[PDB]
């Protein structure tokens, strides 16, 4: 059952890597096997102290177990942090590695799943809560006060794995976080509203 | 209610030194409101997390937002890449 489950990920992650060549990047052994939140600080310590991802499958480095995919996730996150720190923040091979990390992390999170407030004091008294919760990463925009116009910026394409200090082309800039809006879509109008007789 | 307002602005000072990541005109475009971040475009219309059937206080930490977004399974994608060549 786990036989084809590596073969398909192999084929997909090969064919979705043509324009950026992430898989054929150089990568030595790098035995960490650590907490994935430590995955850059551990490689920082590996830089301070002192076989690529395609060749890992050809040598059979991954078993049909939980660790046999945890190592694959670990290797992808390492190569993506390396390729983020290697390029500047505006090049196309920065954004391709960011998109490839997003796609592959989404592909590897699923299919291993197959395999204090007065308003709350009113509502938890009045209603019954069946629920659902999840995590998303937010992003940033800039902020400027001109003469009575009070502008905004676009979304910075800085990835979630950048870790750099926040540079600013102006000190009269400000920075803000954009909370994503998410809920049951508000009932859209019918097609009689969209395209009536004018 | 007007339509033809400008709603984008450009400052005269060329600060184009550390700005290759933002949205440039080809300067820097400065809008009159923020952006809107949308998690997933396609709603998953069934799924009793969302449909709420009328039969039978509980919490559930689902993995990611990707449950609510119609993702294809990988065996079809490998089948289609095999059908590619």
């Amino acid at each position: 059952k786990l036989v084809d489950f590596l073969v398909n990920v192999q084929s997909i992650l090969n064919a979705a890597s043509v324009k950026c060549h992430v898989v054929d990047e150089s990568f030595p052994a790098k035995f960490f096997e650590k907490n994935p939140d430590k995955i850059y600080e551990s490689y920082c310590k590996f830089i301070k102290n002192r076989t690529t991802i395609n060749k890992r499958f050809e040598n059979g480095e991954y078993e049909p177990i939980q660790g046999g995919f945890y190592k694959l996730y670990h290797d992808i996150k390492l190569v993506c942090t390396i390729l983020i720190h290697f390029y500047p923040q505006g090049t196309r091979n920065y954004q391709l590695v960011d998109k490839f990390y997003k796609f592959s992390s989404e592909l590897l999170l699923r299919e291993c799943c197959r395999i204090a407030t007065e308003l709350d004091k009113i509502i938890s008294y009045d209603f019954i809560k069946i629920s659902m919760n999840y995590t998303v990463p937010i992003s940033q925009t800039y902020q400027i006060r001109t003469k009575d116009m009070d502008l905004f910026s676009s979304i910075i394409s800085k990835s979630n794995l950048d870790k750099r200090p926040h540079e600013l082309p102006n000190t009269n800039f400000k920075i803000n976080n954009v909370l994503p809006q998410t809920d049951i879509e508000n009932e859209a109008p019918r097609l009689g509203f969209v395209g009536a007789n004018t | 209610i007007m339509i033809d307002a400008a709603s984008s602005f450009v400052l005269p000072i060329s600060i184009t030194k550390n700005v290759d990541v933002l949205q440039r005109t080809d300067e820097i475009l400065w809008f009159r409101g923020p952006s809107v971040i949308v998690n997933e475009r396609i709603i998953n219309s069934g799924d009793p997390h969302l449909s709420l059937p009328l039969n039978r206080n509980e919490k559930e930490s689902l993995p990611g937002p990707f449950v609510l977004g119609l993702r294809p399974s990988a065996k079809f994608t490998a089948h289609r890449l095999s059908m590619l060549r």
Binding site: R145, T146, K147, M149, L151, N170, N172 | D4, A6, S8, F9, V10, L11, P12, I13, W30
Partner: peptide
């Protein structure tokens, strides 16, 4: 910096819709 009135970019609706991209139709010398 707070005295730096910004420049509006006007769209001019007829330019937004259908602008194409005259001697190169040889009938007019």
């Amino acid at each position: 910096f707070e005295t730096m009135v910004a420049n509006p970019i006007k769209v001019s609706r007829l330019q937004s819709n259908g602008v194409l991209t005259i001697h190169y139709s040889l009938a007019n010398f």
